[PDB]
Amino acid sequence: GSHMIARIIGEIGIEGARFIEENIDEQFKALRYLSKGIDSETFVKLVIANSLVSYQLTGKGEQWWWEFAKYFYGRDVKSIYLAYKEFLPNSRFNRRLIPQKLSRIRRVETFLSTLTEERIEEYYGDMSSLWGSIARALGVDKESKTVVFSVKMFGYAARIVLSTFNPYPMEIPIPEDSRIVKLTKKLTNEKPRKFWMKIARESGVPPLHIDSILWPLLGGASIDSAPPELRDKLAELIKIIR
DNA sequence: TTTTTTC
């Protein structure tokens, strides 16, 4: 792992990650916008469906999640599969692997249909069971990138809908992808998957909350709105990993 | 433009 990184991430803490999530994270902003233009249950269903097709994008993540939010705001959505069948081929930022992606939506449509208000609250109180349930519906490994971040974005949606905050489970790990490998190789020769899981365990900050911290800081987003005590912590983290 | 997944 990294004692240097884990100590500063521990100082930032779940509440520092939460500040970034609710103030800087553009995915959270797009979700908060969408939640104002569609009913709560459809909102959460769409966010999970979107997460499951958000890979190998023809654009950057922030652009795509705003495109998704702007597309469904005020839209009358019945079948989520049918909605995506029309949305994806006309989108700007998600035009690759549409046949594969539509088939994943079709296969998870029955699980999404169980997401009443009460079911969404139950899963938000036990995101590990939601993690396993989504993977089982798809027939994939729950540690796969899309399933892990379907849980993260569900957590964004659920905290908006329910006006409560439950931290992500510690046992949901960041999987390896292109940008986590590119960054981690500069920091260490350790295996990226093991590196970041040990950092989460040592710091006390679940991996999905660490993810919220890393990318805005690396991408150069302003941290000036953070309170000075948290700002100085994020500043030191930047000097360590950027 | 190059920004995970398959059955």
Residue numbers in the entry: -2 to 239
Reported in the publication:
8-Oxoguanine (GO) is a major purine oxidation product in DNA. While no enzymes with an A/G specific-DNA glycosylase or a dGOTPase activity have been discovered in these species, a GO-DNA glycosylase called AGOG (for Archaeal GO-DNA Glycosylase) has been initially identified in the hyperthermophilic archaeon Pyrobaculum aerophilum. Despite very low sequence identity, AGOG is structurally similar to eukaryotic and prokaryotic OGG1 and OGG2 GO-DNA glycosylases and, like these two proteins, belongs to the Endo III structural superfamily partly defined by the central helix-hairpin-helix (HhH) element followed by a glycine/proline-rich region and an aspartate (GPD).
Four complexes were present in the crystal asymmetric unit, each showing a slightly different conformation for the DNA molecule. Few nucleotides are contacted by the enzyme: 2 and 3 nucleotides at the 5’ and 3’ side of the AP site, respectively. The single-stranded DNA is bound in the groove between the two protein domains and the HhH motif. Pab-AGOG interacts via its R93 residue with the T1 and T2 bases at the 5’ DNA extremity and via the Q53, G56, G58, Q97, R101, R104, T143 residues with the DNA phosphodiester backbone or deoxyribose of the residues PED4 (AP site) to T7. At the trapped AP site, the phosphate group fluctuates between two conformations and a large kink of about 90° is observed for the DNA backbone. In the structure, the AP site is stabilized by Oγ of S175 and the amide of the strictly conserved R176, which form hydrogen bonds with the O4’ hydroxyl group. Compared to the apo or 8-oxodG-bound structures, the protein sidechains of residues F146 and W212 show severe rearrangement concomitant with the displacement of the helices α11 and α13 of the N/C domain.
